[PDB]
Write an enzyme that holds these catalytic residues in place. Structure first.
Site: not given
Ligand SMILES: *[C@@H](O)[C@H](O)COP(=O)(O)O
Ligand SMILES: *[C@@H](O)[C@H](O)COP(=O)(O)O
Lengths: 330, 330
Positions: B149, B176
């Protein structure tokens, strides 16, 4: 020992008081705020973020009696009438956040107090001082500011970095814990729309009082760095994420050693250094205003790096406020 | 219509499902995971983050019946025998986070499927594609990765900025939202110690794929971009904080216009643009994988700026996974 009167028993005023009990060169003799000793005592015995008060609290005939010492409780709307000289206060901890100008703040001296240290950044050109950055630049002034919690975190760190490698330029971001000026749910915040949204549900982009406030405390870095804030749903302890371009090239291990050195000598007590797998709650009650998180930062290369540093926007700041009192009092 | 089967009914598998309902090019026909149609239907009916499923969900005969269409539920600890061809699935939405390698993922074709889209950064060399950054570079590969994401949020933005002004170097940070991978209270996390600490009580320094995973999808920025993450106590929607230094000088108005242009043109539906006083909850359900926050960003000078972009780590990424399925499908 120095006599001090606290104007405002909000978050800062209450922790400034708590941190004070452990000292010796200082003593809170009066507390003024639109609240009665009764309620005022209660906000002292119980704290959702820092636990119950460590000492004793009793309300004897309109006044406080903590750990034995009797405190003078008042409730003046207009500083001038504080009659501070009566209780004989040397310096005032101006923590209501209403009088951040000399004009307004001076009303404390007029009231019988010698000097006043604003527990927030001044709205005029009143001098600002941050321990470990420019305290030694104090010129006898009778009215000063201790800046903001973020500047106190960013200033010391930015100094050792500039002093060792030279900061060509840098931008910051502070992942800030929730403060009292925010709302529990979507409400009114005219001058700050974003900051009116539910504090516990959002990540709220904000502005910070440390942006170039550091450019003032540390003139050498003036105009060389600004920043912002991202208010998140935690009750206490924030963190600055500083990205800088360095003049002299330096490896991360070099930067680690440089701040660790400062944290152990020159800036001991202000700057801290750690290599543990820490999180926000691990700094709840932290006295240092800037604890370097070695493992967190990342270097893209020897002249571009991201540094991370924690700080308890309540405990660290308040402690250095008393430190600034004890300083201008020297 | 492409026939799709999902392997793994976690957060992603379920939001991918919901998103697909709106489509006309794709159709979910089967779902595999160690749960029964009963529990499986329940997790589709209710969602604390996105609300009740909008449509009909009934579990008749050990199989799902969503909005009429009958879905085939299964439970195969080993994908090797999913009998994908019985249902006639074209592409498999590999969303278990288990088989992130070619060999392991291959078990999906071996089992009756034609192509497989990995819903996470690949562990081996499986090519990763991010809509808006390099979907054009697809070469028929039977097994692919839609990255993560944060990469989907960062890649597009970085491209338009690189493309227009050229990114000399840059460091990021993504605040996040909590993920299923975190712990409600201080618990065990052998590989990630910080990540075991109470998810809702802390701001937790973390690591992120997006980092140089961008150097891959966006070759030109290889080694010029890296970053981190700070996991905060929010349920959904994160935000990237990109600090970059440009080769070509550009005023902030120039960067606003270039991003807004991209969002209204070549990157419509991927890159989004806004100038409102938004906060995280304002993007819950957001389909764009990167919504530029005009007012939040800040420029130090015409060559060193901090850019802010939002993203629903669940909804955005999930939609694009389907967009990727349709791509390799055409
Ligand atoms: C979305 O793929 C996930 O919830 C978070 O992962 P990231 O590595 O921070 O993008
Ligand atoms: C500490 O003084 C406050 O809670 C936050 O203000 P900043 O300007 O972000 O330091």
């Amino acid at each position: 020992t120095i006599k001090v009167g606290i104007n405002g028993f909000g978050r800062i005023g209450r922790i400034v008081f708590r941190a004070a009990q452990k000292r010796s060169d200082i003593e809170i003799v009066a507390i003024n705020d639109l609240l009665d000793a009764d309620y005022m005592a209660y906000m002292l015995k119980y704290d959702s973020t820092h636990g119950r008060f460590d000492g004793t609290v009793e309300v004897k005939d309109g006044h406080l009696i903590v750990n034995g010492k009797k405190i003078r409780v008042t409730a003046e709307r207009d500083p001038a009438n504080l009659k501070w000289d009566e209780v004989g206060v040397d310096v005032v901890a101006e923590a209501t956040g209403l009088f951040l100008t000399d004009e307004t703040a001076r009303k404390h001296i007029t009231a019988g107090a010698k000097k006043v240290v604003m527990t927030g950044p001044s709205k005029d050109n009143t001098p600002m001082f941050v321990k470990g950055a420019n305290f030694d630049k104090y010129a006898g002034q009778d009215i000063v500011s201790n800046a903001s919690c973020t500047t106190n975190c960013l200033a010391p760190l930015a100094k050792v970095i500039n002093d060792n490698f030279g900061i060509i330029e840098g931008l910051m971001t502070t992942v800030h814990a929730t403060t009292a000026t925010q709302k529990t749910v979507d409400g009114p915040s005219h001058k700050d729309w974003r900051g009116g949204r539910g504090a516990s549900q959002n990540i709220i982009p904000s502005s910070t009082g440390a942006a170039k406030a550091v450019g003032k405390v540390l003139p050498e870095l003036n105009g060389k760095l600004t920043g912002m804030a991202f208010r998140v749903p935690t009750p206490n302890v924030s963190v600055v994420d500083l990205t800088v371009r360095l003049e002299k090239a330096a490896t991360y291990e070099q930067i680690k050693a440089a701040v660790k050195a400062a944290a152990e000598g020159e800036m001991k007590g202000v700057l801290g250094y750690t290599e543990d797998d820490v999180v926000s709650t691990d700094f709840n009650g932290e006295v240092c205003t800037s604890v370097f998180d070695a493992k967190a930062g990342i270097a893209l290369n020897d002249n571009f790096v991201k540094l991370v540093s924690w700080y308890d926007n309540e405990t660290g700041y308040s402690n250095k406020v008393l430190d600034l009192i004890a300083h201008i009092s020297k």
